[PDB]
């Protein structure tokens, strides 16, 4: 048939039955039908209306679900620490110095009748294929993720058993997917006011609970074969056709962080933990990944809580409540990396803060057409 590009917004289908999922989206019947077509079409991950619609819906969900209180307008030892360490359960390790949440929500975009969502099924798709041979038609898409974070990506469903790098053709913005074979997962736990067996305040057999003196200290521990995944990422970067550096030398590639004085979103672990938004320091994590000798190489990161954040989509800041009392736990699967790669004499991978590029990765192969 004959199809044309259209800018008509779609309707979302979800399985979660929360307030935003029921109000803004339809229930999902898992009608994932895919028809392969022997046609050639142009697909762009960044110049896509479905990616912008998903970013706007994610921002609307983030605004409506976790309501901030104030909305602002511009007017040498290597100590690998697991979850069973003695300092872990008491929350007293050597950390950083002092400076309603939505649940498991995942949706799909279903096209209206008279419309289709052509999907590029190319294996070498780097986010921009002007001539994609494998075009697959689908009325309803696959099952995307609404988690918002910098430096990484969690609970994504596009983490295949390989590494592929999305590269924008006009700048150095890069999206890198992870390998699911290495089982790359993280664990984060904040111990709160630790209590004892009940009060027992008496003449004999008297106890004392351990109140957490640092509510602004949390610890995420990071698991998986990350040296092998780091080598796979460097090999895919050296094998990328847009790589201007030395393709036969992966040692000229070096992972990096943004310098001090920049935004805290691009320099720290701007991620959510059950309504409380962490700010961790991956300097020890960067020393562990890059094997920088003579420095502190840890498999964890001291996380600092912050009542204020910055708006990733719009211009402004959001101020939230003080953190509640109790134990805070988070668990997800690391699926993608958001970073900027500069090519030269020494290739530098600077971690970016483009939260929208995760959803641009998730909906980049799909493209709405009008039948």
């Amino acid at each position: 048939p004959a199809w044309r590009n259209a800018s008509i917004p779609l309707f979302c289908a979800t399985k979660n039955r929360d307030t935003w999922g029921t109000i803004q989206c339809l229930p999902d019947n898992d009608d994932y039908q895919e028809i392969a077509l022997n046609v050639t079409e142009a697909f762009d991950a960044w110049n896509n209306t479905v990616t912008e619609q998903a970013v706007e819906d994610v921002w609307n969900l983030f605004e409506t679900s976790i309501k901030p209180c104030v909305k602002l307008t511009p007017l040498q030892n290597i100590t690998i620490i697991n979850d069973t360490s003695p300092c872990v359960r008491a929350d007293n390790c050597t950390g950083l110095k002092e400076e309603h949440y939505w649940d498991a929500m995942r949706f799909r975009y279903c096209a209206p009748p008279g419309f289709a969502l052509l999907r590029c099924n190319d294996t070498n798709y780097s986010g921009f294929a002007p001539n994609c041979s494998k075009v697959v038609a689908a009325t309803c898409t696959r099952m995307m993720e609404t988690q918002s974070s910098t430096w990484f990506g969690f609970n994504g469903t596009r983490a295949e058993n390989r590494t592929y790098i999305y590269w924008h053709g006009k700048n150095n913005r890069t999206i890198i997917s992870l390998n699911n074979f290495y089982n790359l997962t993280m664990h984060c736990k904040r111990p709160g006011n630790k209590t004892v067996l009940p009060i027992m305040s008496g003449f004999k057999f008297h106890s004392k609970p351990v109140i957490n003196k640092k509510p602004r200290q949390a610890w995420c521990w990071f698991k998986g074969e990350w040296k092998e995944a780091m080598q796979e990422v460097k090999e895919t970067l050296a094998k990328h056709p847009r790589y201007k550096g030395n393709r036969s030398r992966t040692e000229n590639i070096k992972f990096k962080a943004p310098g001090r004085g920049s935004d805290p979103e691009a320099a720290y672990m701007w991620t959510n933990c059950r309504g409380e938004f962490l700010y961790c320091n991956m300097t020890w994590f960067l020393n562990w990944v890059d094997n920088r000798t003579g420095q502190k190489q840890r498999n964890y990161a001291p996380c600092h809580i912050r009542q204020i954040i910055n708006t990733w989509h719009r211009v402004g800041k959001n101020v939230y409540l003080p953190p509640r009392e109790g134990e805070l736990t988070c668990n997800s699967t690391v699926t993608s990396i958001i970073a900027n790669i500069d090519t030269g004499d020494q290739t530098d991978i600077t971690f970016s803060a483009e939260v929208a590029e995760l959803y641009r990765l998730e909906l980049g192969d799909y493209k709405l057409v009008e039948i």
């Binding site: 008491a90 305040s201 008496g202 004999k204 057999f205 106890s207």
Partner: protein
């Protein structure tokens, strides 16, 4: 550090009820013998026999509830709330009251030897009425916190009951009050009257006809030596409890092991009156 873990050693759980059983047996035998030879046959001659009779009756109401503590030290308390309310109130009234008569005997002896001439009526007055109006009813006045704060608790398949205060500040101030009633105020009282009677007997070396005070000072010193490690123990527990000294879990556990041990060796003050009557000195 996770928490504070409470655990009693198994050697206390077998040696300790052995101690309560032997203390119970000799206490009930000796106090029943003393009561049935004094308060029923009227064999009283001196004035201290009424005081030691009061000590013996408070003793026997302690011993008649002692096997409840003996079965508490090995097994869970499956009697009821009111039963251990009763055992707690009778324990504190015995422990306070015995201190009051054990100071009253020294007060009578101070009024006897120093004021030998002009004291015939008032020694008889404390023999009849002043002990009843100033020993038992103050001791009964110091039971109503136990009458309001003692309760039972189920802490992990183990029924224990204790005077359960709302917070640790109540516990630390009540252990402090336990010192200032058990040791301190009768201590300076008994040291003052014994220093005065010794300094006056040093002026009275001309006669040695009255030597019945040797049993009194022997009872005083043995009572204080029996109760001193317990008071030092609860003072150490009081000092760690108000976080003036911090050492960790092992110090509190060592303190609890030692404090049950000096409960065992400080319950020996029951069999002090009958052995001293069996020796006459």
């Amino acid at each position: 550090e996770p928490c504070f873990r409470e655990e009693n050693a198994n050697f206390n759980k077998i040696f300790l009820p052995t101690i309560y059983s032997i203390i119970f047996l000799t206490g009930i035998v000796g106090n029943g013998l003393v009561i049935l030879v004094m308060g029923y046959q009227k064999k009283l001659r001196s004035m201290t026999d009424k005081y030691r009779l009061h000590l013996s009756v408070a003793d026997l109401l302690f011993v008649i509830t002692l096997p409840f503590w003996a079965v508490d030290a090995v097994a869970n308390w499956y009697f009821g709330n009111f039963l251990c309310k009763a055992v707690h109130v009778i324990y504190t009234v015995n422990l306070y009251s015995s201190v009051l008569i054990l100071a009253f005997i020294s007060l009578d002896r101070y009024l006897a030897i120093v004021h030998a001439t002009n004291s015939q009526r008032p020694r008889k007055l404390l023999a009849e009425k002043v002990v009843y109006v100033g020993v038992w009813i103050p001791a009964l006045l110091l039971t109503i916190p136990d009458f309001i704060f003692a309760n039972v608790s189920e802490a992990d398949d183990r029924y224990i009951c204790d005077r359960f205060y709302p917070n640790d500040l109540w516990v630390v101030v009540f252990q402090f009050q336990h010192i200032m009633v058990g040791l301190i105020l009768p201590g300076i009282v008994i040291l003052s009257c014994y220093c005065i009677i010794i300094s006056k007997l040093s002026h009275s070396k001309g006669h040695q006809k009255r030597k019945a005070l040797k049993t009194t000072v022997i009872l005083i010193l043995a009572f204080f030596a029996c109760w001193l490690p317990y008071y030092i123990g609860i003072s150490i527990d009081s000092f760690i409890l108000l976080e003036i000294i911090k050492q960790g879990c092992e110090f509190e556990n060592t303190v609890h092991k030692w404090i049950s041990i000096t409960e065992a060796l400080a319950f020996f003050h029951c069999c002090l009156n009958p052995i001293l009557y069996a020796f006459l000195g």
